[PDB]
Every structure is written in C-alpha cells, then in structure tokens.
Design a protein around this ligand. Sequence first.
Ligand code: MG
Ligand code: MG
Ligand code: MG
Length: 95
Amino acid sequence: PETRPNHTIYINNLNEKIKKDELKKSLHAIFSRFGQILDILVSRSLKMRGQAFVIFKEVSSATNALRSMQGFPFYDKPMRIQYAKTDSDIIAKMK
RNA sequence: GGCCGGCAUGGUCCCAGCCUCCUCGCUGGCGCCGGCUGGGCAACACCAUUGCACUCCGGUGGCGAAUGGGAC
Ligand SMILES: [Mg+2]
Ligand SMILES: [Mg+2]
Ligand SMILES: [Mg+2]
C-alpha cells in the first residue's frame, strides 16, 4: 500500500546479497539527483535486510524520487518505494 | 585451527607445484588411515526471511583440504 508524504522514502525488494556500505553508495549515486540527501539507513539484520530508508531534506525530493524510481531495476531487482510511515530522527531532530 | 593413536617413512638444502571459513603468509600448510576436539560468523555458500527502522545482533556448512624435480 502506502501512506502520507514524508521526507523519507522506504525502499524494499532490494538485493540482499549486497553489502551495507556498497548498497548505501549505489543509492546515493541513483538518488542524489532528486535533491539533498540527509542520510541513508541500511541494516543487513534478519528483519531489516533488503530494505533502505532514504532521508531527503525536502519532501518534494522524496515525492519525485518515489514517482521516478518506482520499480527501477537495481542490482537485477525491481525496486519498491513508498513514503516512510514515520519521520526519521534526523528530520524530527530539526523541526 | 588443536590434540591423539596406528601403519609408513634415511638426512640437510634449493626450486617449482598445490591447498585453504583460521587470508593467503614475506613463522602458513600439504605421506596413508582413524578418533577426539577449539574459535567464528569477519569473508564466502546454502537455508530461511518481502521485512517500517533510527540499538550491533537468524541458522547451518567448509580444514572431510593440498606433490613433483634438483643439489649435496
Ligand atoms: Mg605408532
Ligand atoms: Mg636420492
Ligand atoms: Mg628431491
């Protein structure tokens, strides 16, 4: 499904075989064009693998990145994007 | 990776080859057979997982592996 707009986009269906550091970098490579990125959170734990949170400084960036990159073939798999259900700490830690 | 027992095996050195979860080594290891046993998930493989976080954190596996020449 999905939710309300947010500064952060929740990505899943990501190739689980890629290491944390490389995954982070390839994501900046792919998403930096949509706007400034505050951070990318990735974990390879049993619950969080195959998922990533890309935190943009501006919601419009997240909105554009979500429309443009939906299903983008990344590491041989169709990337799935939704707005994150809750604000990330970096974002709340500001406003 | 460690230890043990059996059979085998003349020594020292040189070169090359090979092996590998104990990285690969410029203090590595490498005769045949059998048994006991340690560490670790860091890498790799498989299994399982489609998962909404801001706390590093599923499991199993392999090391049950690896030889030729020369000089004295
Ligand atoms: Mg004996
Ligand atoms: Mg001789
Ligand atoms: Mg010889």
